[PDB]
Amino acid sequence: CGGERYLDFLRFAVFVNGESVEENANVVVRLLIRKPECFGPALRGEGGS
Amino acid sequence: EVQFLRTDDEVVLQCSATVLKEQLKLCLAAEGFGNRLCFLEPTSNAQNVPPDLAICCFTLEQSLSVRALQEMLANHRTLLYGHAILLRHAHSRMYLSCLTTSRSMTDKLAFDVGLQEDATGEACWWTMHPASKQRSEGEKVRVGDDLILVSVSSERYLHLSTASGELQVDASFMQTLWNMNPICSCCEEGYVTGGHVLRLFHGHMDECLTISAADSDDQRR
Amino acid sequence: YGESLCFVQHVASGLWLTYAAPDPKALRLGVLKKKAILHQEGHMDDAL
Amino acid sequence: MSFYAALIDLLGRCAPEMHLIQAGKGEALRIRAILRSLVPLDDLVGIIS
Amino acid sequence: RLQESISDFYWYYSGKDVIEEQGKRNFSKAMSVAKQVFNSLTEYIQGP
């Protein structure tokens, strides 16, 4: 529940007027992969469904 | 005097693992011909079983900043943290790369680490990052430092995986500390050095030390 | 003071003062503390 | 379900625009490759099905 | 840190044939700061 609320904020930061803001999109993706736990128990890599 | 890693130097990528409370040191190795994938050669038992170091040596060909790498991709330096390095396999003359395939079943987000025939593309470039707060970006990389290698193309760490029963190296999102132990920096003309392949001649270039030919009765021993 | 880098060694055993390399899954607990141990090899950043 | 739907929505909006991919920009291609690795195509079809 | 930033800025315009107006203005202010740092370092050691 808490994670979804932060996800939609990043949705508005990277997508403006129907186009993707590449400056923000690249930063968010790199930040997300540096902390893989942001993807939930799934998409965890090892031991993750 | 503090040793600094420079280009054209031969190094070995060495990591550490825990096996039955024992610290086991492993070197990244690859055959090149017939098998592109990289494996781990143990070296802690070199007293009793010599490791196969002929396929563990890599040459630091280039070391560039991220912007310089981007510019050169569109078209003896000292190693600095945050730079991108190009590792060439000493034996097969191939380049260490983050392969797009994945033979592991435990990690779905991991990629195989292997050798690439050419240095083209960004899949064969790795960025060095400090493992601890002791070193910062832009500082010189010193011998014995723990490094964090990140693939430029895949944004994944050079990871040692212990999920299976064996020890395997792959490109995952979990970091792993590596040591770039130097092998040789600069060799004078002539002046035999360790790790070379040579012949031992007896007299005036007439007889040389050798074993029996193939399919011989003495089992070539 | 503040310039010399010192490695602490136990005289009787020869062990070096270093950290314990904290096990993962403990970072979520907020434990930035690293347990100090005496080890035969240690690490390169053991200087104090 | 809402978390992963929000997560997939965020990653989808982080994808580069078509004109960047057609231009062959290296950064755009790298980002799309990372996104494809995170979310396999078969899982997308399975959820829709 | 300033030198590394200037080096990165050069690589950004290395491919481009001509540096545009905004890039030149940012280069000018970076050089002005670099002049002061060099002058400050010079004042530290002179005397000598």
Curated annotation (Swiss-Prot), chain C:
It is found in: Sarcoplasmic reticulum membrane. Detected in skeletal muscle (at protein level). Fast- or slow-twitch skeletal muscle. Homotetramer. Can also form heterotetramers with RYR2. Identified in a complex composed of RYR1, PDE4D, PKA, FKBP1A and protein phosphatase 1 (PP1). Repeated very high-level exercise decreases interaction with PDE4D and protein phosphatase 1 (PP1). Interacts with CALM; CALM with bound calcium inhibits the RYR1 channel activity. Interacts with S100A1. Interacts with FKBP1A; this stabilizes the closed conformation of the channel. Interacts with CACNA1S; interaction with CACNA1S is important for activation of the RYR1 channel. Interacts with CACNB1. Belongs to the ryanodine receptor (TC 1.A.3.1) family. RYR1 subfamily. Cytosolic calcium-activated calcium channel that mediates the release of Ca(2+) from the sarcoplasmic reticulum into the cytosol and thereby plays a key role in triggering muscle contraction following depolarization of T-tubules. Repeated very high-level exercise increases the open probability of the channel and leads to Ca(2+) leaking into the cytoplasm. Can also mediate the release of Ca(2+) from intracellular stores in neurons, and may thereby promote prolonged Ca(2+) signaling in the brain. Required for normal embryonic development of muscle fibers and skeletal muscle. Binding of [3H]ryanodine indicates that the heterozygous channel is activated by Ca(2+) concentrations 4-fold lower than normal. Single-cell analysis of cotransfected cells shows a significantly increased resting cytoplasmic Ca(2+) level and a significantly reduced luminal Ca(2+) level. The calcium release channel activity resides in the C-terminal region while the remaining part of the protein constitutes the 'foot' structure spanning the junctional gap between the sarcoplasmic reticulum (SR) and the T-tubule. Pore opening is mediated via the cytoplasmic calcium-binding domains that mediate a small rotation of the channel-forming transmembrane regions that then leads to channel opening. This is Ryanodine receptor 1. The gene is RYR1. The chain holds residues 341 to 388 of 5037 of the full protein.
UniProtKB/Swiss-Prot annotation, chain E:
Signal peptide: none annotated. The N-terminus is blocked. Channel activity is modulated by phosphorylation. It is found in: Sarcoplasmic reticulum membrane. Binding of [3H]ryanodine indicates that the heterozygous channel is activated by Ca(2+) concentrations 4-fold lower than normal. Single-cell analysis of cotransfected cells shows a significantly increased resting cytoplasmic Ca(2+) level and a significantly reduced luminal Ca(2+) level. Belongs to the ryanodine receptor (TC 1.A.3.1) family. RYR1 subfamily. Cytosolic calcium-activated calcium channel that mediates the release of Ca(2+) from the sarcoplasmic reticulum into the cytosol and thereby plays a key role in triggering muscle contraction following depolarization of T-tubules. Repeated very high-level exercise increases the open probability of the channel and leads to Ca(2+) leaking into the cytoplasm. Can also mediate the release of Ca(2+) from intracellular stores in neurons, and may thereby promote prolonged Ca(2+) signaling in the brain. Required for normal embryonic development of muscle fibers and skeletal muscle. This is Ryanodine receptor 1. The lineage of its organism: Eukaryota, Metazoa, Chordata, Craniata, Vertebrata.
